[PDB]
C-alpha cells in the first residue's frame, strides 16, 4: 500500500483505490495503474520533474529502501499478477529487485522528489508507475 500527498491531491495505484478515492475522483488511468483523488489537506510530497534514471524506493515486504537504476516511462508488458492480467501498462520503468502485491504503493524517489509508486513485480523486477509527467499535480 501507499500514497503520494501533493497539494490537495492523492496519487494511488487504481487497483488500490478506495470508494472515498472515487467519490472525489480527479483523474484515473487503468493502463497507468494510477488513480488521483481530491484531499481536504495540504499534502507535502514534492513530485520530481526531471529524467533521473537513478532513485531509492521503499520495499515495505524488506522494510527496506533500496537505491536503484531504473528504466525510461515506456509501454511494457506485464505477466498477470494477482489484481492484474497479463497485459501492456503504459508509463512504467523497471528496476531489478523485490517486487510483491504488498509493496504496491511504495515510494520511488530521486534528488528533485517523487518520481513514481510501484505498480508491478515478478520475474526479479520492480516496476513504477510514473508521474513525473503530471505536471497539473502542481498547481490548482
Ligand atoms: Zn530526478
Given at each position: 500500500s501507499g500514497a503520494i500527498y501533493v497539494g490537495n491531491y492523492r496519487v494511488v495505484n487504481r487497483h488500490l483505490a478506495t470508494h472515498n478515492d472515487w467519490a472525489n475522483l480527479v483523474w484515473e488511468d487503468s493502463s497507468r495503474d494510477l488513480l488521483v483523488s481530491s484531499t481536504t489537506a495540504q499534502g507535502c510530497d514534492t513530485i520530481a520533474r526531471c529524467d533521473c534514471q537513478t532513485g531509492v524506493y521503499y520495499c515495505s515486504s524488506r522494510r527496506k529502501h533500496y537505491p536503484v537504476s531504473f528504466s525510461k516511462p515506456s509501454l511494457i508488458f506485464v505477466e498477470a499478477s494477482e489484481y492484474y492480467p497479463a497485459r501492456y501498462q503504459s508509463h512504467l520503468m523497471l528496476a531489478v529487485g523485490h517486487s510483491e502485491?504488498?509493496?504496491?504503493?511504495g515510494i520511488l524517489r530521486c534528488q528533485h522528489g517523487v518520481v513514481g509508486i510501484v505498480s508491478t513485480g515478478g520475474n526479479g523486477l520492480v516496476g513504477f508507475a510514473d508521474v513525473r509527467d503530471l505536471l497539473w499535480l502542481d498547481e490548482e
Open positions: 502485491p504488498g509493496d504496491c504503493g
